[PDB]
Design a protein around this ligand. Structure first.
Ligand SMILES: [Br-]
Lengths: 142, 140
């Protein structure tokens, strides 16, 4: 609605649905991972207030992407894995117009990939519980 | 303004449909792999058919009914006789999922569209369908 374009989610159907909606500015993403992707922090701005939302569980090591001036998110990729009986993100990475980051996570399964030939990622939705069950993205022009 | 993909190889020649006003139908030509696609659509007052890739294999036509639109695309990227191509391709509408068309496995990709629709195509083609990507638009 209101003109949104949402692609995904990739992953399983467990955990609880989340939807950040679209941001004015994503500032940074932290991807928490070990054997699989445990969760994500998204830090974003709105009217000069910086806020952080966490989705998924409390495990894993953090892997950060701090967006530089003129840097924006142009790809996402990973693997959907079966882990301990749950269908979750086993690996997750992102590309910007400047650099690739990751993927983070150590469990393979069914790959997915989202090259954005025109446009950028503008927000996130998905499912989280003990791990990051699923992830999807909002898109807008670049 | 919103283009995702293409998934597939670097061979063949580039194509680019741009976005349509309305997609009427898509035909997927396949045998062992995806040979190519026809897209029939409305565009700036005209009704047009374009063909991308080769024309071998068998055509499989999906005609979109009133209130029906394309909300997913998926497939596998395969090596076929030395060409990195779509080995399998399928589409979902808001009513039903179709496919796969083609028989050759390789690396899967999937594009579920939770909000919006596919409005057109771009990619690369030769004898077969080397690569395919989509233009995306919001729902109306
Ligand atoms: Br349409």
């Amino acid at each position: 609605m209101n003109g949104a374009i949402k692609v995904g989610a990739w992953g399983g159907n467990g955990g609880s649905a989340f939807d950040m909606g679209p941001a004015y500015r994503i500032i940074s993403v932290k991807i928490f991972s070990g054997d699989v992707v445990d969760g994500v922090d998204v830090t974003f701005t709105y009217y000069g207030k910086t806020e952080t939302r966490h989705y998924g569980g409390s495990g894993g090591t953090p892997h950060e992407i701090v967006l530089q001036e003129g840097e924006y998110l142009v790809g996402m990729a990973g693997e959907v894995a079966n882990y301990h009986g749950a269908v979750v993100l086993g690996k997750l990475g992102f590309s910007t117009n400047k650099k690739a980051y990751g993927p983070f996570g150590n469990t393979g399964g069914t790959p997915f990939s989202l090259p954005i030939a025109a446009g950028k990622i503008s927000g996130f939705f998905g499912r989280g519980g003990k791990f990051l069950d699923a992830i999807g993205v909002y898109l807008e022009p670049a």
